Amino acid sequence: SKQPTSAENSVAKKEDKVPVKKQKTRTVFSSTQLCVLNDRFQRQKYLSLQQMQELSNILNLSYKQVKTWFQNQRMKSKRWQKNN
């Protein structure tokens, strides 16, 4: 696999350029993570079973969280995205 613990594309681009509007949704994702996610999804095919645990360690998040985020964005194409 590819374990991207380092060597990223420093500042690729952002899909969102909306500087803090509509208030805060309590929990939020940073453009830093978003950029890395989008870059890696463009450079690679997707996140593999191992890659999600790597990513989890890098962003100091949980494997349960990283997997669920991916599967939600994955399944939205077939069913729909859910916040729960």
UniProtKB/Swiss-Prot annotation:
Residues 22-81 bind DNA. It is found in: Nucleus. May act as a transcription regulator. When overexpressed, promotes entry of cells into S phase and cell proliferation. Belongs to the Nanog homeobox family. This is Homeobox protein NANOGP8. It comes from Homo sapiens (Human). The chain holds residues 75 to 157 of 305 of the full protein.
